[PDB]
Design a protein around this ligand. Structure first.
Ligand SMILES: COc1ccc2c(c1)cc(C(=O)NS(=O)(=O)c1ccc3ccccc3c1)n2CC(=O)O
Ligand SMILES: COc1ccc2c(c1)cc(C(=O)NS(=O)(=O)c1ccc3ccccc3c1)n2CC(=O)O
Ligand SMILES: COc1ccc2c(c1)cc(C(=O)NS(=O)(=O)c1ccc3ccccc3c1)n2CC(=O)O
Lengths: 289, 273
């Protein structure tokens, strides 16, 4: 097995290197925590890392891999922010002991061949116009889970549909891993952290606060019912300059095929110029609020 | 969080996935190597050879799963083989949320057997994946008879970075060479006699192969052509991964045919020239 220096940041590229280090550590009693990222790390990722570090005796593995198989288009792949120098420095600052940074060739030596086919949830919301997008995400996440074999894996709640689908993958394939959702870290005005916030110009940045403002307005309006909660969110989005709403949807917490009851999740997707932003919040309807 | 009861050297039967998962984890912690033999029950000699191959690994514990993917005699046989674990889940236990996330095979699944049944292999790979995740065996054993199935499994294991060794076990055959299959019982005596042409064609090919690929194929085809009531669906020579056969070297020759209502398959290692 490769060298592993405790208390230091150890960087592995070969899947076999991280797998052997991981297994060795699990056998010596350390619980392995996985934080899978596409790099370009911000405070929301550091929140994921901090949550993983809280687990007694853990060793934290952060993966950084921009997965070509979840991009469609159209230069989306080429466009994705890459800032690997900032990434490793932050990990060192947080005392993470393993970074896993595989090559595309090591992840996909045979190209795309066997893949994960998500359930019907993957065709709706974000997946409506991107029909293979979530097959790309679940295939890579399955691979990462098999390579690292973590006890727990950590995701932000901001991409909530993705989180739900990952929980489905875990249940549906009997994966022996705990999925931990971490609440979305926000800028001080409530804007959800995101890699893509860097694409907002000053005016778009100012308008973008409408997404989180609409969602919290809805969560408080919801004592008056679902209609009022949705109408409040819609009004705030409507008042915002140059915000173009894609969808604004209220669903059950698992995102359907069940009607909303007392507790739910309100999801919004909107374009500012060319930048697509997503956010969501827990909603309690009526009495539960 | 007490481990379910396990009595070493007895046949222990579990229906709950969580239970066999806890036991297999407890066993692996104490040194034993976990071996998995997936079956659909109605055990025959082919299954017993998979069991015998698994039992010979030193330190092995053998898990035999019995699951019909949508009797006490099976268990008796497993007992007589010294198998310690039978995993016998219900459909509901395996699919508590119904059909949802599934495995999509690569394009090999659309070829050969995937012609009459284009979603067959998606089903097989999904349930094999789940069985591997529940039991987490060091090694998993399949017969070579369903060769395309086997290759698709090794693609699954490679593609998803699974940490199991896939062991293909030579096909058990009747005395005249007919490959073991649960379907052989349905053949009336005329069909049963004609069915020997599949294996006869493939062994003839494998010996003709010193004279090259075309000789091997023409020898198999002549043998199939000497049999009445044997409607050949395909007869193909491929490399060992089921891609195109290289100009020489190692390959596999596969056949499938219908006799009355029964579809039969067989295959064989071929060495060119
Ligand atoms: C706890 O607070 C937060 C808040 C926002 C977060 C996160 C954490 C994490 C992300 C995020 O997008 N991370 S990621 O680009 O590196 C990422 C992380 C895991 C992924 C798994 C499958 C597919 C895509 C993935 C993308 N994001 C959102 C974003 O960067 O747009
Ligand atoms: C609803 O409208 C569409 C449009 C295209 C679609 C689909 C649906 C579904 C597929 C599809 O599943 N294609 S695929 O099985 O070859 C496939 C499957 C999984 C993939 C994962 C990551 C990237 C690409 C992937 C392509 N494909 C791509 C295709 O058939 O080539
Ligand atoms: C070592 O020699 C042999 C020879 C023939 C074999 C076998 C082994 C195994 C089978 C067989 O098909 N077994 S099975 O119906 O129980 C079966 C068949 C397909 C399976 C696919 C995924 C998971 C489990 C599977 C179990 N069969 C053929 C058959 O029984 O139809």
């Amino acid at each position: 097995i490769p060298a592993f220096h405790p208390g230091e940041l150890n960087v592995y590229s070969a899947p076999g290197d991280v797998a052997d280090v991981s297994r060795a550590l699990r056998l010596t009693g350390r619980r392995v925590m996985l934080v899978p990222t596409m790099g370009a790390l911000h405070e929301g990722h550091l929140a994921l890392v901090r949550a993983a570090k809280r687990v007694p005796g853990s060793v934290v593995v952060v993966s950084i891999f921009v997965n070509p198989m979840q991009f469609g288009a159209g230069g989306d792949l080429d466009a994705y922010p890459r800032t690997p120098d900032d990434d490793l420095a932050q990990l060192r600052a947080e005392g993470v002991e393993i970074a896993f940074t595989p090559t595309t060739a090591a992840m996909y030596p045979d190209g795309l061949r066997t893949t994960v086919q998500p359930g019907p949830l993957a065709a709706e919301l974000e997946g409506g116009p991107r029909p293979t997008h979530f097959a790309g995400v679940l295939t890579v996440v399955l691979k990462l889970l098999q390579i690292v074999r973590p006890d727990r894996v950590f995701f932000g709640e901001k991409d909530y549909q993705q989180l739900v689908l990952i929980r489905q993958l875990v249940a549906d394939f009997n994966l022996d891993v705990a999925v931990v959702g971490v609440p979305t870290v926000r800028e001080a005005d409530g804007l959800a952290m995101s890699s893509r916030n860097r694409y907002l110009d000053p005016a778009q940045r100012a308008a973008a606060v409408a997404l989180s403002a609409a969602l919290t307005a809805a969560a408080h309006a919801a004592t008056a019912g679902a209609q009022a909660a949705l109408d409040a969110a819609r009004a705030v989005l409507d008042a915002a300059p140059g915000v173009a709403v894609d969808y604004l949807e209220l669903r059950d917490i698992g995102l359907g095929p069940m009607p909303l009851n007392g507790s739910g999740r309100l999801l919004v997707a909107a374009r500012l110029g060319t930048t697509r932003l997503l956010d969501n919040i827990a909603i309690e309807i009526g009495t539960f609020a």
